[PDB]
Design a protein around this ligand. Structure first.
Ligand SMILES: CC(C)Cc1ccc([C@@H](C)C(=O)SCCNC(=O)CCNC(=O)[C@H](O)C(C)(C)COP(=O)(O)OP(=O)(O)OC[C@H]2O[C@@H]([n+]3c[nH]c4c(N)ncnc43)[C@H](O)[C@@H]2OP(=O)(O)O)cc1
Ligand SMILES: CC(C)Cc1ccc([C@H](C)C(=O)SCCNC(=O)CCNC(=O)[C@H](O)C(C)(C)COP(=O)(O)OP(=O)(O)OC[C@H]2O[C@@H]([n+]3c[nH]c4c(N)ncnc43)[C@H](O)[C@@H]2OP(=O)(O)O)cc1
Lengths: 354, 354
């Protein structure tokens, strides 16, 4: 029901970014067909049809090619060379479908000294300065889950590449190959820090900057009950609203941006936030511009009113799952269809007319 | 001359996710005109034309609308209602140009108890379970910069929304409004953890999961020189390669996935990595499938061979900046044009024939 209704996608079963990108297309209305080796409980595989094929066999290669012959997009996330040796590489695909957006999702890229090397998110972000910048200054870097490599700088860039190439195709009449490497996407994801580095506004010191937990006004605080609030009161007026709620006299504190006294500032705020429960502060700052919010664990998210009101999550069999994003005023997406039984590839071919 | 060459984008100057989305469009060849309030050293403002106008005045509003009538996309990132009051709301823009993709970038969304409330990245990810999940278990949550709210679940979702709507526009001949809320995008960004929580494969316990630093084989380790390597050896055979490079006898270690013995495994690995310098580990692995990589600080990145060969970065003046991502085989993106002097708004309108 979304904006991508009409769009046909072949997804070669992979892990991490590939399936995430395929899920978002499906979310937004795309007809995604995932080819697996010969009924799912991975919510990630919502909004598909699943077929099965041995791509190492003559019959399996031939069917996949018939399916690809009728697709708009192909998603693959294997090592470079893998689809080639299978006979499903870009050059082989062009012979059956020159309108195909051949989307290749990797960590290191299609080429380069590391392109044949195994890796995971933490590796791609360690090589480009990102991982080094995450965590407290007094200890080793901490991975920001696999949000930055696999998803933010991964599947999200594959998607931009895919949708950008479809725009191109409206005038060229032709597809092309999208080489989405997590080491690249994630660097453009963090371009703000690269920009700020050049103007003296970000340093290579972990835990000592405006947005990394270094600023007492941009960090979490432990409250009386061991639970946490997030403070993000960057602007002076929001910061002022923040002090007031805490019952602190501004004239008694160090200036917000005297970094020399940041330890003193943080200590006073720590004492303030520790004096009451997280839910107390959420009540104090409920409607304010203080940029103070309760840090909710996954299990609690479903009870937060702004989360509820906006239907950010739906209940899908044994748990909450995020509704599609972003939102569209005219061609709104449907609630995702759950993973179902595998179906006959020929039936998919029949549907598509292949 | 990237794939979005031809696309016309009016960007109403803002902070964080909006400019980043506009940057990525321009990176990929879009004609982006940024209207600012009346030459930059924010490399983030690369690939633009900058014009200036007073949107509150009769005249400034008039020109902005003339610009908008000739555009494909409008990006705005203010509080809901702001453009409405200016006379640049979706309904007003529709009257001049019903093909316009009106892209509204916010943290809380257009509607809901928090839609009028101030906030920043940290606040949006505090409300949807994300920030709670980030950092060591024994400490308060750490913010993963503004990578997940502003960018990964922010600009990136705005971008996917923009390009999805353009796809739909081919059929309907019409545009629509994209409501891109960081609270929504970041939740879809983290869909994997929502999926896993439902099958017992992820817990709300910070720092005690497979991908959050909890697993000894998926975390950083400090080396003899006080620098760090990242270990990402999820699969048995990568883990096995990792142990072989360390000179550890697997028969003498606890099993990779015996969680009960993780502290013991981590102590053994800690002791090993601490015995030589990062660049020694750098060299011992460097080539293998051990998923061990050096943790490079921003300042070191430009010296890494894989970074160099693939031209992930370019030198702007005074520093390295990320080249466009992802990459396109046929319509390759140009090296970004640096920020230039403000252009005359009438001159852009002349260009666009507006
Ligand atoms: C120093 C920083 C740059 C570095 C930095 C970078 C990144 C970050 C991260 C952490 C962030 O999250 S930043 C993003 C913050 N949040 C969002 O974008 C969510 C949606 N936005 C908002 O809620 C708000 O815009 C907010 C960011 C909180 C700021 O609130 P605000 O009251 O200052 O602004 P507002 O959007 O409510 O209203 C805008 C105001 O300006 C006016 N305006 C705009 N353009 C023009 C123009 N060309 N000519 C004349 N007037 C103009 C509008 O009329 C409007 O006024 P009005 O009286 O109608 O409210 C933090 C800091
Ligand atoms: C939590 C769980 C649920 C999800 C999850 C999400 C994310 C993550 C982490 C954090 C990640 O980062 S995942 C993404 C990691 N990196 C990448 O994707 C980058 C690109 N990929 C790669 O380099 C590799 O595929 C890598 C992931 C490192 C694994 O290496 P590998 O040797 O196992 O894989 P490979 O690509 O070299 O080989 C593919 C192999 O599969 C075969 N294949 C495919 N389809 C079929 C079929 N239908 N029938 C028969 N055979 C088939 C191919 O022929 C090929 O074999 P080959 O002869 O080429 O070795 C982990 C798990």
């Amino acid at each position: 029901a979304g904006p991508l209704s009409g769009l046909r996608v072949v997804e070669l079963a992979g892990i991490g970014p590939g399936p995430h990108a395929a899920m978002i297309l499906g979310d937004l209305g795309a007809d995604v067909v995932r080819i697996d080796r010969p009924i799912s409980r991975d919510a990630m595989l919502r909004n598909r049809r699943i077929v099965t094929a041995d791509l190492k066999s003559d019959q399996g290669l031939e069917l996949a090619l018939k399916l690809i012959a009728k697709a708009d997009v192909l998603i693959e996330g294997y090592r470079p060379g893998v689809t080639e040796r299978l006979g499903l590489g870009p050059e082989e695909c062009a012979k059956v479908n020159d309108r195909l957006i051949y989307a290749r999702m990797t960590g290191w890229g299609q080429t380069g000294p590391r392109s044949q090397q195994a890796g995971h998110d933490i590796n791609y972000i360690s090589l480009n300065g990102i991982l080094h910048a995450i965590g407290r200054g007094d200890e080793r870097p901490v991975p920001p889950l696999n949000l930055v490599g696999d998803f933010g700088g991964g599947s999200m860039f594959l998607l931009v590449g895919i949708l950008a190439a479809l725009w191109e195709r409206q005038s060229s009449g032709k597809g092309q190959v999208v080489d989405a490497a997590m080491v690249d996407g994630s660097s453009v994801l963090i371009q703000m820090m690269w920009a700020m580095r050049a103007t003296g506004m970000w340093t290579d010191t972990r835990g000592a900057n405006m947005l990394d937990g270094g600023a007492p006004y941009y960090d979490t605080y432990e409250c009386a009950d061991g639970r946490y609030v997030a403070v993000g009161a960057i602007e002076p007026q929001f910061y002022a609203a923040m002090l007031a709620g805490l019952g602190l006299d501004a004239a008694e504190l160090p200036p917000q941006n005297d970094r020399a006294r940041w330890p003193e500032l943080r200590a006073l705020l720590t004492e303030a936030f520790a004096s009451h429960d997280r839910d107390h502060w959420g009540a104090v700052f409920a409607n304010s511009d203080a940029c103070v919010t309760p840090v909710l664990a996954f299990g609690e998210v479903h009870n937060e009113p702004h989360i509820i009101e906006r239907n950010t999550f739906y209940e899908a069999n044994g748990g909450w799952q995020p509704m599609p994003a972003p939102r569209f005023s005219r061609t709104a997406s449907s609630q995702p269809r759950p993973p179902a039984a595998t179906i006959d590839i020929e039936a998919v071919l029949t549907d598509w007319d292949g």
